[PDB]
Design a protein around this ligand. Sequence first.
Ligand SMILES: OC[C@H]1O[C@H](O[C@H]2[C@H](O)[C@@H](O)[C@H](OCCCCCCC3CCCCC3)O[C@@H]2CO)[C@H](O)[C@@H](O)[C@@H]1O
Ligand SMILES: *[B]([O])([O])[C][N]C(=O)[C]([C]C1=[C][C]=C([O])[C]=[C]1)[N]C(=O)N1[C][C]N([C][C])C(=O)C1=O
Length: 265
Amino acid sequence: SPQPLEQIKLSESQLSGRVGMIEMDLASGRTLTAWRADERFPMMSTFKVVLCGAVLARVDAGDEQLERKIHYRQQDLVDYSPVSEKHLADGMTVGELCAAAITMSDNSAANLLLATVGGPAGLTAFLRQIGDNVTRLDRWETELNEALPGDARDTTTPASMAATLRKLLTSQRLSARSQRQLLQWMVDDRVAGPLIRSVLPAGWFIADKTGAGERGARGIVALLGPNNKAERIVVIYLRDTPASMAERNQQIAGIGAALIEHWQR
Ligand SMILES: OC[C@H]1O[C@H](O[C@H]2[C@H](O)[C@@H](O)[C@H](OCCCCCCC3CCCCC3)O[C@@H]2CO)[C@H](O)[C@@H](O)[C@@H]1O
Ligand SMILES: *[B]([O])([O])[C][N]C(=O)[C]([C]C1=[C][C]=C([O])[C]=[C]1)[N]C(=O)N1[C][C]N([C][C])C(=O)C1=O
């Protein structure tokens, strides 16, 4: 494979789309590779990690419990809700809702949790509280995936998302137990985690949350590293490409391959 930046450029050319990417040391926050890192991209379902960061902050403060059971109704549901559809009779705990939102990308689970943090406006306020002055959530699932060309709604930048993820996972803004919980939810991703492991060389750690939207929008936020360690945050977003889902997946994988072959920097 090419060097990381060369592969990122190739991916843009082949996709006829914009790619945004950051590679950041998790421990120190050092930025290693950056491409369009200050440009806006739809978050899509990658927002679900930040959402559950906000939930955990409420838990730490004693304003929420992961055990608390929410008994929601069918009228609360939106599409792509494989876990929450199973529990109209019996409900789900707040912790189960975060697990479903992150590991299964469950949209109704996400919307239920979003309401508990004050909706899109409340999550945006939480982001400002942790010093992210760029990321914004404006809509609910599933409209937040619309990815209209030039629309700033529901966007982040690779740089802001990476910094925000590092803050949530490591800065001690969250309790130790909450930091550990957020990480484990990403480790447990069922949408892409197992597939990614199936193509990673032996020894490479992965934890992740993916997202998909309209007009080619697709993304991943991840922890990756050799020696079975979460060494780096890697954030990749695609937008405004007519390419197939299969190619979008392959292009993101190709950027990963370039990172893997050229890790020491
Ligand atoms: O010499 C380096 C490695 O080269 C190949 O590994 C290949 C692997 O066979 C392939 O499946 C993967 O595809 C890339 C898969 C990437 C997975 C998704 C990446 C995510 C992770 C973080 C967020 C962005 C994307 O590339 C590597 C590097 O060429 C060999 O198979 C392996 O034995 C060897 O250790
Ligand atoms: B997450 O925010 O990435 C979850 N993403 C979704 O639920 C997407 C999945 C999807 C992507 C692309 C296409 O063409 C369909 C579904 N949902 C989504 O983008 N759309 C947008 C809004 N639309 C309303 C008519 C949906 O129902 C929908 O699910």
